[PDB]
Amino acid sequence: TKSVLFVCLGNICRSPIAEAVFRKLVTDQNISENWRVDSAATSGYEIGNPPDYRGQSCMKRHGIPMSHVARQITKEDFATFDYILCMDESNLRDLNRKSNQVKTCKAKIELLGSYDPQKQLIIEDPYYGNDSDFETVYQQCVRCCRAFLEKAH
């Protein structure tokens, strides 16, 4: 069984959308059973909270199921996940820092955007943005998750 953890700073705006998009893709391809899919935060700012309601509104428009309770990444996650796919370089710095504090790091840690055929490298925090910024995040997750599923690097 393969595993991927999507990560952003708070686990309310970006990573729950990536997770939900990816889970839908594998489910549509009859292989959800082969995959462990999750999302988590670098920080503890939003622990226990559901995804940003603007994100829920976006996913509803696109007919993508989403349900998550925000949680912080743990030391155990570096041992168990094949891939940790994050949103921006700040996430990446933080994840690399945490990963070096741990004995076992199975996970390949990289930017989700590094999979975008369109080379939109960074998935920017839409929290201080509007609905159009959530839509961009959504569209990025679609391209990136599809490409990741196709061929992980």
From Swiss-Prot:
Q: What is the effect of changing residue 127 to F?
A: Reduced phosphorylation and activity
Entry-linked CDD domains? LMWPTP (cd16343)
SMART domains assigned to the protein according to its UniProt record, in alphabetical order = LMWPc
Entry's localization field: Cytoplasm
The entry summarizes how activity is regulated as: Inhibited by sulfhydryl reagents.
Top EC class of this enzyme: hydrolase
Which Enzyme Commission number(s) are on file for it? 3.1.3.48, 3.1.3.2
Give me the Gene Ontology terms describing cellular component: cytoplasm; cytoplasmic side of plasma membrane; cytosol; extracellular exosome; sarcolemma; synapse
Does this entry carry the keyword rRNA processing?
Answer: no
Any one GO molecular-function label of the UniProt entry? non-membrane spanning protein tyrosine phosphatase activity
Keyword terms of this UniProt record: Acetylation, Cytoplasm, Hydrolase, Phosphoprotein, Protein phosphatase
* PTM annotation (Phosphotyrosine): residues: 127-128
Q: Provide the primary localization.
A: cytoplasm
What InterPro entries does its record include? LMW_PTPase, Ptyr_pPase, Ptyr_pPase_sf, Tyr_Pase_low_mol_wt_mml, Tyr_phospatase_low_mol_wt
| Gene Ontology biological process terms in this record | chemical synaptic transmission
The active-site annotation reads 8 (nucleophile), 14, 125 (proton donor)
**Subunit comment:** Interacts with EPHA2; dephosphorylates EPHA2. Interacts with EPHB1.
Function, as annotated: Acts on tyrosine phosphorylated proteins, low-MW aryl phosphates and natural and synthetic acyl phosphates with differences in substrate specificity between isoform 1 and isoform 2.
- Provide the family line: Belongs to the low molecular weight phosphotyrosine protein phosphatase family.
Protein name (database record): Low molecular weight phosphotyrosine protein phosphatase
What is the organism of origin for this protein?
Homo sapiens (Human)
Q: Which gene encodes it?
A: ACP1
